[PDB]
From Swiss-Prot, chain B:
Changing N137A: Does not affect ability to cleave and inactivate human TRMT1. 3CL-PRO exists as monomer and homodimer. Only the homodimer shows catalytic activity. Interacts with host FBXO22; this interaction promotes the proteasomal degradation of nsp5. Residues 1-300 are cytoplasmic. Inhibited by pyridone-containing alpha-ketoamides compounds 13a and 13b. In turn, alpha-ketoamide 13b (tert-butyl (1-((S)-1-(((S)-4-(benzylamino)-3,4-dioxo-1-((S)-2-oxopyrrolidin-3-yl)butan-2-yl)amino)-3-cyclopropyl-1-oxopropan-2-yl)-2-oxo-1,2-dihydropyridin-3-yl)carbamate) inhibits SARS-CoV-2 replication in human lung cells. Inhibited ex vivo by michael acceptor inhibitor N3. Inhibited ex vivo by compound 11a and 11b. Residues 1-300 form the Peptidase C30 domain. The chain holds residues 3264 to 3568 of 4405 of the full protein. This is 3C-like proteinase nsp5. Cleaves the C-terminus of replicase polyprotein at 11 sites. Recognizes substrates containing the core sequence [ILMVF]-Q-|-[SGACN]. Cleaves and inactivates human TRMT1, preventing tRNA guanine(26)-dimethylation of tRNAs. May cleave human NLRP1 in lung epithelial cells, thereby activating the NLRP1 inflammasome pathway. May cleave human GSDMD, triggering alternative GSDME-mediated epithelial cell death upon activation of the NLRP1 inflammasome, which may enhance the release interleukins 1B, 6, 16 and 18. Also able to bind an ADP-ribose-1''-phosphate (ADRP). It catalyses: TSAVLQ-|-SGFRK-NH2 and SGVTFQ-|-GKFKK the two peptides corresponding to the two self-cleavage sites of the SARS 3C-like proteinase are the two most reactive peptide substrates. The enzyme exhibits a strong preference for substrates containing Gln at P1 position and Leu at P2 position. The active site is at H41 (for 3cl-pro activity), C140 (for 3cl-pro activity).
Amino acid sequence: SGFRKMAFPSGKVEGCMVQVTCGTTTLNGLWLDDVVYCPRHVICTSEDMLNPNYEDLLIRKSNHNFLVQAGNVQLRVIGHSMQNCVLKLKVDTANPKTPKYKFVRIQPGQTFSVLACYNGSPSGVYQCAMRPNFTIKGSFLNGSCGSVGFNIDYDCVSFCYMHHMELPTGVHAGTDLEGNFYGPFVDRQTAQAAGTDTTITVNVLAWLYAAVINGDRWFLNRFTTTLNDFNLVAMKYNYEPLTQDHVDILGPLSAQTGIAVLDMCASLKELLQNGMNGRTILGSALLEDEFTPFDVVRQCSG
Amino acid sequence: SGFRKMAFPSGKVEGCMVQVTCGTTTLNGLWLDDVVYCPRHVICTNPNYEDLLIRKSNHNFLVQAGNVQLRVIGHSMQNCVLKLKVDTANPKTPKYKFVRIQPGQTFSVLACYNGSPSGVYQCAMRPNFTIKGSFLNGSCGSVGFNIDYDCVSFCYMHHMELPTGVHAGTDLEGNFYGPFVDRQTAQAAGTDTTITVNVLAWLYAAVINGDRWFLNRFTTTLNDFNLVAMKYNYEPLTQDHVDILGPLSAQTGIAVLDMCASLKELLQNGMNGRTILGSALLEDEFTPFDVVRQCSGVTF
Ligand SMILES: Cc1cncc(C(=O)N2C[C@H]3CC[C@@H](C2)N3[C@H](c2cccc(F)c2)c2cn(CCc3ccsc3)nn2)c1
């Protein structure tokens, strides 16, 4: 029993974290095979950041301007290239600790683990979700750039996030490992701000199914709803639309618990109307939206 | 910015987890140098473990480190932990120590299944000596640890789930945390209490992160506040707690008894539909050190 925000074991990623230094700037890089991936803004000065011309800055760099350090070992850079907003530094040594891995771009609502890192040394691991507004509510201090987000399935590490910046509301923005930002953000000091966030409805429903699995039914009711009536109400609480894909995805949890998806939608509607009246669900006094349907089946059943 | 329930990087521990099978029981062990540590209740069959173990032969214990088999060459018990001597020392053994933690202190848990780590989370030793973990069948032998520089301090090994869903275990010397035994008897968690010094730490974390609405002009005294704590089933606040929070008090300008007044008012009046660091409840599983470490970055 129990239900925690559980991260993946981080060892496979730990063995890939290095320090990258350009000029006065040091941040983290991800060392896979003979390539080190890091945010391209490592080549910028703070001045450059209003309107940086990355192509112009990079053509001026020599391989030996990049200092890469893996533990106590300096790696020799032998080439470099830029892919979208990520710098790829080719190094003379392949990482002998390279796990089986892939690069995956995730959708809003997906979860992943973050290995927060400073000066190429991992500090801690925690679970995160990609918010509907393409930010993440992480925990990152100065020097955390280049920290990565990942899932691990059957010993394959799927890298899905690389950290670039903190937005003014204290939430975080970054790219996939092909260097494409999530959301409308840019690696430029601009007046960019997180869009208004919403609640990840399909994840809330999955968590409610998790509550029933672990033995709590107090929030259920005898009503049902149409999908469209549910969305009409949910939008009034800044909940994300629930799609037929979402209904299909919850099929297994519906089947396991005996509670039809649209009946669980009726319960959520009432919870939004009533609050919890001093009660908790899986230890929380708020509705949790950073557990996915996949996560629930992974942690609750096996 | 931000504040998350954060665990230590688990890599150094992952390389020590093994699967231990005896009879019909399979569970997780911890392989350090040439010993595998696991719960003694892996022993076959009111138990008398010193008797049951006499019956077992080394070869009754199948130990799998991934795909490799470690051969057992010896066994002994230390309290509720079984120690299997194996023929191969773990080449991935980290620098480590066995430590016993105090209620209120936190640690990371690497939850495992068939000697395969599957998740890591951060927990506190509750005042009632249980932990609010997430464990399913097969988790027994999963371990808790902290990392200080390069040194792993192992502090917990999971032995059982209790009827309220919380969990009980031992230190790595096999001494239970709390009034529990490893046998099928009637056992229950005692009434728990809230860890006051940790709630205060988390309020400081909130302030550091810009959440200041609960602050007020008032201050108080230990004696006065401790009467409120007892009323609300909060642990007593000691002078040593006050000293430990010293740093955060200096960094935010909010003295502990200044912050206690904020907490008193939250306990008496509630949060009035507001939240702190994204919670509608007062959180008590972050220590002062956890807050300082995460709001001022240390790395391992
Ligand atoms: C609280 C916190 C959370 N998470 C990360 C940090 C953190 O550390 N950074 C993120 C921000 C803020 C400082 C610096 C690094 N970023 C600036 C920036 C501005 C606009 C877009 C963008 F993508 C980056 C920047 C980059 N550069 C080039 C030299 C350099 C690159 C890395 S450090 C210095 N100059 N300003 C902080």
